[PDB]
C-alpha cells in the first residue's frame, strides 16, 4: 500500500515518501539525505552506500560504482570502452554481450550484471524508507534520465524487481524535478521549463513544455562526463602541483591511493566553498609520510573551474536552438543535482537568463526523489499532493 519515490543516481541515490500531500526525503542510518550508489565486497561483508564509499580507497578493486553507465548496455558499446578507464573494478563481457562486473567476495571470484549492482542500491534505499516507516515498502516509482532507451529502462525496472519492489512506473528525471515544484498544477497555459541537472558525474539539460498537466520533453543535451567529480579533479591537479612546489618535485600522482585520499578531501573543501569564502584541504601523511595542507579561496576554485562552469551554458544554448525558442521564453529554470549548489554556477545561469531567479527551494540533490515520491503517491490513489 505504501509507495516510495527513488532517484537511482549515477553517484548518489535518494528516497522520498509523499504522505498526506507533503514529501519527506528520508535520511539513511548515518543521517544522510542521499546515499552513494556504491556497493563494496570485502573478506566478510557486502557494504552498500556510505560504508562502501568510505572504504573505496582501501579496497578499489572490489568497490563498485557507476553501474548506471553500464545498465541496459552491451559490453561492446563504445561508451563502455571509453568509460572503463575510470573504473578500478573489472568489467568483462558475457557470452550474451552483457557487462559482468567482477569482484572478490569472501575470498571468491563473483560476477554481477549492472542491474544486480543497481538492485543492491535500490534494496538499501527500500530499507532506508522501511526503517523510517517501521513497516515494509513494496511499491515504488524509479526515475531514469530522459535519454535512457528501452533497454536501459527495462534493466532499471528489473533492478527494482530484484530488490523486491513492485515498480509502479519508470519516469524521466527532468519531469520528476518539474513535478516536485508543482509546475504541472501551477496555474494554466503552456509553460516552457528548463531543467539544469549537474550531479556528481553527469550534466543534463532538458527543455520541457507543460500544457494542461501534460509534460513533454522537447529537447535534451548535456555532457555525460561533466559533474562534481571533474571539479574535485581540478582541486586534485592543483594540489598535486602545489605538493611538487613544497616538497622538491615529489609527485603524489605516482601513488593511486595518495590521489584517492586527496580527492576525498578536495571534494569536502569544494562543498565548504559553496557557503564559505575559504576552505582547507588537509591530508596527513599523504605521500612519503609527508603531511599536506593548503588553503583554497572560493575565487581560486572558481578560477580553476572557470571554463568548465562557463561551458555548462553551451548545452543550454543547444536545447533552446533544438526547440526553436528564445531564452526569454523559458518560464522556469529548475536547479537539480548537488553541483547546482556552487554559487558561481547559480550566478552564471541567472546571468544567462537575464536576471531570472532559478527555482532552487528544494535541495537540488533531492528534487528528483521528491517528484518521484509525489508520482508514487498519485499512482497509489492518493490525490492529497494535488
Ligand atoms: N554543497 C555542495 N557544493 C558543491 N557540490 C556539491 C555540494 N553538495 C553536493 N555536491 C556534489 O554533488 C555531486 C552529487 O550530486 P547528486 O545530485 O547527489 O548526484 P547524482 N548521482 O544525481 O549525480 C557530488 O559531486 C557532490 O560533491
Ligand atoms: C519477481 O522476482 C524476480 C526475480 C528475478 C528477477 N530478475 C533477475 O534475476 N534478473 C537478472 C538480470 C541479470 N542478471 C541476473 C539476474 C526479477 C524478478
Ligand atoms: C575545460 O572545460 C571543459 C572540459 C571538458 C568538459 N567535458 C568533457 O570532458 N566531456 C566529455 C564527455 C564525454 N567523454 C569525455 C569527455 C567540459 C568543460
Ligand atoms: Cl504512499
Ligand atoms: Cl513515521
Numbering used by the authors: 33 to 418
The authors write:
A single heat-shock 70 kDa-type chaperone, PfHsp70-x (PF3D7_0831700), is present among the parasite proteins exported to the host. ATP hydrolysis triggers conformational changes in the chaperone that cause sequential binding, holding and release of exposed hydrophobic segments in target proteins. 233 chemical fragments were screened for binding to the ATPase domain of the Hsp70-x chaperone from the malaria parasite Plasmodium falciparum.
Interestingly, two of these residues (Gln339 and Asn343) in the parasite chaperone differ substantially from those at the same position in the human counterparts (leucine and glycine or serine, respectively), raising the prospect that connecting subsites A and B via this path may also contribute to ligand specificity. In contrast to site 1, site 2 is relatively removed from the ATP-binding cleft; thus, it is less likely that ligand interactions there would affect the catalytic activity of PfHsp70-x. Furthermore, the site comprises a shallow surface on the parasite chaperone, which suggests that engineering high-affinity ligands targeting this site may be challenging.
